[PDB]
Write a protein that binds this DNA or RNA. Structure first.
Ligand SMILES: [Mg+2]
Ligand SMILES: [Mg+2]
Ligand SMILES: [Mg+2]
Ligand SMILES: [Mg+2]
Ligand SMILES: [Mg+2]
Ligand SMILES: [Mg+2]
Ligand SMILES: [Mg+2]
Ligand SMILES: [Mg+2]
Ligand SMILES: [Mg+2]
Ligand SMILES: [Mg+2]
Ligand SMILES: [Mg+2]
Ligand SMILES: [Mg+2]
Ligand SMILES: [Mg+2]
Ligand SMILES: [Mg+2]
Ligand SMILES: [Mg+2]
Ligand SMILES: [Mg+2]
Ligand SMILES: [Mg+2]
Ligand SMILES: [Mg+2]
Ligand SMILES: [Mg+2]
Ligand SMILES: [Mg+2]
Ligand SMILES: [Mg+2]
Ligand SMILES: [Mg+2]
Ligand SMILES: [Mg+2]
Ligand SMILES: [Mg+2]
Ligand SMILES: [Mg+2]
Ligand SMILES: [Mg+2]
Ligand SMILES: [Mg+2]
Ligand SMILES: [Mg+2]
Ligand SMILES: [Mg+2]
Ligand SMILES: [Mg+2]
Ligand SMILES: [Mg+2]
Ligand SMILES: [Mg+2]
Ligand SMILES: [Mg+2]
Ligand SMILES: [Mg+2]
Ligand SMILES: [Mg+2]
Ligand SMILES: [Mg+2]
Ligand SMILES: [Mg+2]
Ligand SMILES: [Mg+2]
Ligand SMILES: [Mg+2]
Ligand SMILES: [Mg+2]
Ligand SMILES: [Mg+2]
Ligand SMILES: [Mg+2]
Ligand SMILES: [Mg+2]
Ligand SMILES: [Mg+2]
Ligand SMILES: [Mg+2]
Ligand SMILES: [Mg+2]
Ligand SMILES: [Mg+2]
Ligand SMILES: [Mg+2]
Ligand SMILES: [Mg+2]
Ligand SMILES: [Mg+2]
Ligand SMILES: [Mg+2]
Ligand SMILES: [Mg+2]
Ligand SMILES: [Mg+2]
Ligand SMILES: [Mg+2]
Ligand SMILES: [Mg+2]
Ligand SMILES: [Mg+2]
Ligand SMILES: [Mg+2]
Ligand SMILES: [Mg+2]
Ligand SMILES: [Mg+2]
Ligand SMILES: [Mg+2]
Ligand SMILES: [Mg+2]
Ligand SMILES: [Mg+2]
Ligand SMILES: [Mg+2]
Ligand SMILES: [Mg+2]
Ligand SMILES: [Mg+2]
Ligand SMILES: [Mg+2]
Ligand SMILES: [Mg+2]
Lengths: 271, 46, 94
RNA sequence: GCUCGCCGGAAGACCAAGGGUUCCUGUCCAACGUUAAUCGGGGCAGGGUGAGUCGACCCCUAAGGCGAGGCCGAAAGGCGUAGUCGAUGGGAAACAGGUUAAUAUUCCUGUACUUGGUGUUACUGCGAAGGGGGGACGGAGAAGGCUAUGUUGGCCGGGCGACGGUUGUCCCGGUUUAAGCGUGUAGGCUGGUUUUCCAGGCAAAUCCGGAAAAUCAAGGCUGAGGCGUGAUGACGAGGCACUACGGUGCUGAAGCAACAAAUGCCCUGCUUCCAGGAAAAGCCUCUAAGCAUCAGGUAACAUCAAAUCGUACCCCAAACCGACACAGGUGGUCAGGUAGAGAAUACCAAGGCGCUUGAGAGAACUCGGGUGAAGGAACUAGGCAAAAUGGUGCCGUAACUUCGGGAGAAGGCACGCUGAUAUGUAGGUGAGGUCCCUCGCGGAUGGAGCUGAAAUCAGUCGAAGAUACCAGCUGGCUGCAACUGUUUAUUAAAAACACAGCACUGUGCAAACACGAAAGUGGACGUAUACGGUGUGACGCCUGCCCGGUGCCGGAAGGUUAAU
RNA sequence: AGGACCGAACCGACUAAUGUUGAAAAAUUAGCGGAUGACUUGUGGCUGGGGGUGAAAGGCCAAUCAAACCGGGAGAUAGCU
């Protein structure tokens, strides 16, 4: 439920919260946590590789089952939890033999439902089965690219991938970007759209709310000196040049994909 | 005002001390230069 | 058992002082200048054998040497170690 | 020595960092000290730092560093696994009193505590590099219970007043006491217990996790403070004595209650929010190989051990960083009275100072202030600077608006003291007494005593009652930027940058991109509701025409065209 | 509840005066802004010079920055003084 905030102060004027009352109001499950130390966008050389990353609230990492290998054993869903590590909410599930794991929460999943992986699983939102067992034309998420590698496609808060075709060893997918990609028919996928679909309806409202998420401010390139950026300089506002990166690569329109290994897997590009 | 030398013995020895010089190759060449010049205090280290 | 040869090298000198004269008559504690690497057990073993007297406890402290100037040349005296050796009651020592 | 003045959320006290003998005593006055100096942080000599509990070391890890092999690289070397380092965080335990010229939670007196050794005695499943638990964690807010501490009364000791009065509802001073041990309270959390079973916890497991069934609602965990003990002690105003006038010795009364009360404690709580809040060991537990009456295990008692290093002194400063005995800078802890919302501010206590040139004179001029006739911005680039406003309560408050604001708009009234209501009210606190009780740190009832606003009425004083310090000038029009924020350390704080938003574009994951000869790493333990780049810059209404040029994207028939 | 309000600590530096061989190689005095947050601070770490870092002033990188410092080529070169 989106909640428009009342304008008691500027900085609360434009805030829309996304309030989900079903999330667990307690501590997360302690065995599945581990330390997630921040980086600041800096590699092992100490240099800033990717800009604008730094600060933000401390975040513990939640070990999430993407591989989803407990086949045959049914699992009931204990509660839904908030995950700071990702945009989608996660679900704490309890198998029959007593193991607890975290999965990505699908759209219609709530506390108390039963999920089950494996080939003999039913087709309800939550089950995970190889895509030679999933009917053509259904919406799945948490899709593997390689069998047993773990789900890599359609993991962000409201995404999903449709299965449009199958020719023997491959299935053809309609990715969320609109790209048509071939994936082997033995890769696991999880039924239904992924949960937190109204995540994109939030508006942060103030500058500090982006600093809470560890997003340092972005200085636009024309506000610099020519030693700093190709856009920099000028006596006033001058931009008489084609828009490039800080490293002189065209940005408005120039393609950058240079992977000739995976070109056989791409049916059509995005539009 | 706050001036540029704010001393700390721990930071003085980790940065300029004896074992910090002997750790790397160029730091060992620093101690070879000071021995060739004949320094009384070969490093920072007390 | 501390070896008998080391126990002869532990003790250096008695320390004469106003505080040493006070501790001998009130707390019954002698003040000794000891070797610098000597520990408390080595002092207690040395005083109980070389002076033939019963030691209750030994407290030690290291005296840092002063910086003096002979003429105009700077210099530093040696660090030495000081022991407050409390004898048991009834025991007496010169 | 007596006065005077100054600080007193510090200009007092305790440390860390840093310094390194500046500490204490004797002695010296050349140099050093912005003067003299008998003095000194100066010279010279001597003295001074005492730990099983404080701290370090040590056990443990964070960021990070190093890194066997390894991978990579002309060489140097780079990265990194197992590991091993690395506190600023986790990990056993001591308090009170006394004492030195100088140290004390270290010495002494008193009373404790912890962890290891060995050794007997009783007891017998022990065992890890493994499993589990615990350690173990955010911001904000709300009270409640307390204590530190203060005030008043009582109590004890002293006093009866240089000048009117002062045997009293008078004045002065004291009224202190710990860790530990016992009690388990306010209060917080929690359903217990037994059996059966179990694709989980890499194997195992009695443990944890999960299924059952049965039974009991009441056990457990945490917990400030209080009370008791510690304590017939210690401390204690004063006296009594000697006096090197510094002191030293001796003796010692009362040692209670009420009320107020923290930013400290319960509280690592509770409530709530989204931005979703270290790790590892100690500690607890489970078994694996192993061990089989041995080892080990816990239990009592006895005994032994607890090393080494630091401990002086300054530490918002004359001792540290500033070349100086430099209006600078410097993290933590302690937080008395009166007024006050207050850690503001005024004056004070404890405590510490008067800032290492003075003495006169009382010109111009400069510096920092005070007041000013009449006028009141005529000054000026410009009300720069000054002056003015200033508190609380109540009344009242416009355009406009995103309905929150504007707004403390503006403007005005009241304000002291005394008495009465009421010898102190409403309220707070809550004793005896009585009742009840699973009996206690219990529950009612009960109101003594203490504390105590605020208001009305009456009176009264001054020129003036928010009387000092303290403490908004206000309104009208308009440019720009939405805002809070940011910036040229040291002439520019702005309309510049950032910003939420918006859009374009790239990017299918071994992602684009970036740092790297490379290995790799960041992006990201993320996956197109994601990430990078670029422009614009909340919000409202909107964003028109041009693809010739320059880019970019798509095309592949022809022309042209490299090595070969 | 709040990048909410008033206001000390604390952080900052808008205006004026002083000072300009200063008390001070940027400070004092009287005002001033922020003051639960994009806050501030201790300790330790990491990024290195055509490199870092930069809410972007060509700012900052040890009183030095349109390419730091130190040593070396080195007695660079100087139709100039
Ligand atoms: Mg960015
Ligand atoms: Mg942006
Ligand atoms: Mg920007
Ligand atoms: Mg610019
Ligand atoms: Mg350029
Ligand atoms: Mg122009
Ligand atoms: Mg033009
Ligand atoms: Mg002792
Ligand atoms: Mg010692
Ligand atoms: Mg000296
Ligand atoms: Mg002295
Ligand atoms: Mg002297
Ligand atoms: Mg003289
Ligand atoms: Mg002189
Ligand atoms: Mg001296
Ligand atoms: Mg300790
Ligand atoms: Mg490491
Ligand atoms: Mg090697
Ligand atoms: Mg390495
Ligand atoms: Mg270690
Ligand atoms: Mg520490
Ligand atoms: Mg520690
Ligand atoms: Mg002292
Ligand atoms: Mg463990
Ligand atoms: Mg908190
Ligand atoms: Mg009390
Ligand atoms: Mg009189
Ligand atoms: Mg009289
Ligand atoms: Mg009295
Ligand atoms: Mg007690
Ligand atoms: Mg001391
Ligand atoms: Mg002081
Ligand atoms: Mg000073
Ligand atoms: Mg002076
Ligand atoms: Mg006060
Ligand atoms: Mg004050
Ligand atoms: Mg002076
Ligand atoms: Mg005059
Ligand atoms: Mg005036
Ligand atoms: Mg006038
Ligand atoms: Mg007059
Ligand atoms: Mg007049
Ligand atoms: Mg005029
Ligand atoms: Mg004029
Ligand atoms: Mg003015
Ligand atoms: Mg004024
Ligand atoms: Mg105009
Ligand atoms: Mg602005
Ligand atoms: Mg502002
Ligand atoms: Mg400036
Ligand atoms: Mg300025
Ligand atoms: Mg990678
Ligand atoms: Mg712009
Ligand atoms: Mg246009
Ligand atoms: Mg065109
Ligand atoms: Mg065209
Ligand atoms: Mg083309
Ligand atoms: Mg605010
Ligand atoms: Mg600044
Ligand atoms: Mg000021
Ligand atoms: Mg304020
Ligand atoms: Mg410029
Ligand atoms: Mg500089
Ligand atoms: Mg350079
Ligand atoms: Mg150059
Ligand atoms: Mg040459
Ligand atoms: Mg030359």
């Amino acid at each position: 439920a989106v909640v428009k905030c009342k304008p008691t102060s500027p900085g609360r004027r434009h805030v829309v919260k996304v309030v989900n009352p079903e999330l667990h109001k307690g501590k997360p499950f302690a065995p599945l946590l581990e330390k997630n130390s921040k980086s600041g966008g800096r590699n092992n050389n100490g240099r800033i590789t990717t800009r604008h990353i730094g600060g933000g609230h401390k975040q513990a990492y939640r070990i999430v089952d993407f591989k989803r290998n407990k086949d045959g054993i049914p699992a009931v869903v204990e509660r839904l939890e908030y995950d700071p590590n990702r945009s989608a909410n996660i679900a704490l599930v309890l198998y029959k033999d007593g193991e607890r794991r975290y999965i990505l929460a699908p759209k219609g999943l709530k506390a108390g439902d039963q999920i089950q992986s494996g080939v003999d699983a039913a087709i309800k939102p939550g089950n995970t089965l190889p895509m030679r067992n999933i009917p053509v034309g259904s919406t799945v998420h948490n899709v593997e690219m390689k069998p047993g590698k773990g789900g890599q496609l359609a993991r962000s808060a409201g995404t999903y991938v449709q299965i449009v075709a199958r020719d023997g060893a491959y299935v053809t997918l309609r990715l969320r970007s609109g790209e048509m990609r071939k994936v082997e028919a033995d890769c696991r996928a999880t039924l239904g759209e992924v949960g937190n679909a109204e995540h994109m309806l939030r508006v942060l409202g103030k500058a500090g709310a982006a600093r809470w998420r560890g997003v340092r401010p972005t200085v636009r390139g024309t506000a610099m000196n020519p030693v700093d950026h190709p856009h920099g300089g000028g006596e006033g506002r001058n931009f008489g040049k084609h828009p490039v990166t800080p490293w002189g690569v065209q940005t408005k329109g120039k393609k950058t994909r240079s992977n000739k290994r995976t070109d056989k897997f791409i049916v059509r590009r995005r539009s | 005002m706050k001036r540029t030398f704010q001393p700390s013995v721990l930071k003085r020895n980790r940065s300029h001390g004896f074992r910090a010089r002997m750790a790397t190759k160029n730091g060992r060449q620093v101690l070879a230069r000071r021995r060739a010049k004949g320094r009384a205090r070969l490093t920072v280290s007390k | 058992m501390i070896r008998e040869e080391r126990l002869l090298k532990v003790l250096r000198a008695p320390h004469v002082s106003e505080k040493a004269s006070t501790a001998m008559e009130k707390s019954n504690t002698i003040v000794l200048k000891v070797a610098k690497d000597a520990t408390k057990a080595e002092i207690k073993a040395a005083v109980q054998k070389l002076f033939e007297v019963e030691v209750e406890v030994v407290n030690t402290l290291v005296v840092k040497g002063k910086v003096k100037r002979h003429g105009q040349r700077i210099g530093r005296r040696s660090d030495w170690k000081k022991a407050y050796v409390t004898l048991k009651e009834g025991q007496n020592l010169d």
